[PDB]
From Swiss-Prot:
Subunit structure: Exhibits self-association properties. Part of a complex composed of THSD1, PTK2/FAK1, TLN1 and VCL. Interacts with APBB1IP and NRAP. Interacts with TLN1. Interacts with CTNNB1 and this interaction is necessary for its localization to the cell-cell junctions and for its function in regulating cell surface expression of E-cadherin. Interacts with SYNM. Interacts with SORBS1. Interacts with CTNNA1. Binds to ACTN4; this interaction triggers conformational changes. Interacts with FLII. (Microbial infection) Interacts via its globular head domain with the central portion of S.flexneri IcsA (also called VirG).
Region: C-terminal tail, residue numbers: 1-175
Tissues expressing this chain: Metavinculin is muscle-specific.
Disease: Cardiomyopathy, dilated, 1W: A disorder characterized by ventricular dilation and impaired systolic function, resulting in congestive heart failure and arrhythmia. Patients are at risk of premature death.
Species of origin: Homo sapiens (Human)
Compartments where found: Cell membrane; Cell junction, Adherens junction; Cell junction, Focal adhesion; Cytoplasm, Cytoskeleton
Modified residue annotations for Phosphotyrosine: Y174
Free-text note on domains in this protein's UniProt record: Exists in at least two conformations. When in the closed, 'inactive' conformation, extensive interactions between the head and tail domains prevent detectable binding to most of its ligands. It takes on an 'active' conformation after cooperative and simultaneous binding of two different ligands. This activation involves displacement of the head-tail interactions and leads to a significant accumulation of ternary complexes. The active form then binds a number of proteins that have both signaling and structural roles that are essential for cell adhesion. The N-terminal globular head (Vh) comprises of subdomains D1-D4. The C-terminal tail (Vt) binds F-actin and cross-links actin filaments into bundles. In isoform 2 (metavinculin) a 68 residue insertion in the tail domain promotes actin severing instead of bundling. An intramolecular interaction between Vh and Vt masks the F-actin-binding domain located in Vt.
Boundaries of the shown chain within the full protein: 960 to 1134 of 1134
Highest taxon listed in the record's lineage: Eukaryota
Family as reported in the entry's similarity comment: Belongs to the vinculin/alpha-catenin family.
UniProt PTM: Phosphorylated; on serines, threonines and tyrosines. Phosphorylation on Tyr-174 in activated platelets affects head-tail interactions and cell spreading but has no effect on actin binding nor on localization to focal adhesion plaques.
Region described as Facilitates phospholipid membrane insertion: spans on this chain: 44-87, 161-175
Task of the protein: Actin filament (F-actin)-binding protein involved in cell-matrix adhesion and cell-cell adhesion. Regulates cell-surface E-cadherin expression and potentiates mechanosensing by the E-cadherin complex. May also play important roles in cell morphology and locomotion.
Name of the featured protein: Vinculin
Amino acid sequence: QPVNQPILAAAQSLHWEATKWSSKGNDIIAAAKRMALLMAEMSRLVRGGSGTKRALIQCAKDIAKASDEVTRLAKEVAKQCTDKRIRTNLLQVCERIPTISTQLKILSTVKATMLGRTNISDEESEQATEMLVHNAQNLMQSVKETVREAEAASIKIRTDAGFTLRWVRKTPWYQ
Ligand code: NA
């Protein structure tokens, strides 16, 4: 009850996928790991405490900043990619993430402002939490799918490609 469980589970789900790989030479992995860590912080932040109001807003801003890095790099991976099927799939997912993370910023600010205000009912409070939780699950899922496809895409690369990512296997774990 102290820490939201469905937010922590979503963060955990992405952490498991991202920790299948090394961050070295791979930004997408590094940013996805930062995102999973921040989303676990978010599950504590949702239950407001003095000084959590500014932290809730900043945590969502950091999550959105890390998701822009994932989006930006995955778009670069996809354009070079020779397989149309993979290239198209990767581009749809990359496109979705900015919208989801923009919504995370809105809902976090709404939740934080509310915490700051004593009057709101337990219903409005629970509902603002459930909207945040839904967004968090959607975000974690989208990034996880983006990781998978960016790796699949990596196998096929343009001979003349400007940059490459490193995909080295590591033993995954949960935070
Ligand atoms: Na390892």
